[PDB]
Amino acid sequence: IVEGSDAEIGMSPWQVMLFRKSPQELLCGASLISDRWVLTAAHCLLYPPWDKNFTENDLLVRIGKHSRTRYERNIEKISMLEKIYIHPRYNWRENLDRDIALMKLKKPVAFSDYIHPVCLPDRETAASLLQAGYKGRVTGWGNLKEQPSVLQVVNLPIVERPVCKDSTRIRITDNMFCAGYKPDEGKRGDACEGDSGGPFVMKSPFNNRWYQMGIVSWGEGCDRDGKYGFYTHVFRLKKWIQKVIDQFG
């Protein structure tokens, strides 16, 4: 996260760290959506241009964390993957269209003060909140600049689709939205390397619950003027999420 702030303890209890088993390192962010399902970016697991193709056994999920590097004894929980599910129409070749994946955990994680799931949007929350100028929140342990001691947080406004499109030569789709400030707005901030797969969340003013509207997906650079971060549109892919969960528990 570039130009964010340190998280408060328990501020993002759905936050998940994707962790490489050997060499032990951060791979990506991710989010907890139930006591056995974790949501992330497909490109965290599969990205052939960079020879990335992880299997279950290559990975761990670390939940309840705050410190990046520290083993947070009696607080974090470390989980093994049962199965990875990548969107069947994930476009890694071109623009990361449908950049989404589910991970099923071997065993359910115990909720606690620091571990708790985020909601997924229904159509009406999505329609109410996914509006230009409305702000969401992005969290992650990735680069501070184009690495932090603790989880970082940044609040960023959703940007109008024409402005998103005019900021880049990449083809953008209805399965993505972009967020960040304009040059003229002053304020700045963005996701960066290692924040991939982490959640873009919004607090519904209707029921005061946090919903995950986006997944950190792609950008050109980090926190560049006139550029915006791009997020997987979670509501647009909810049919596939539900099918998977419904079909594999």
Partner: peptide, 9 residues
């Protein structure tokens, strides 16, 4: 830079 995690995982 990562603290070692319990062998068990």
């Amino acid at each position: 830079d990562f603290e070692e995690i319990p062998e068990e995982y």
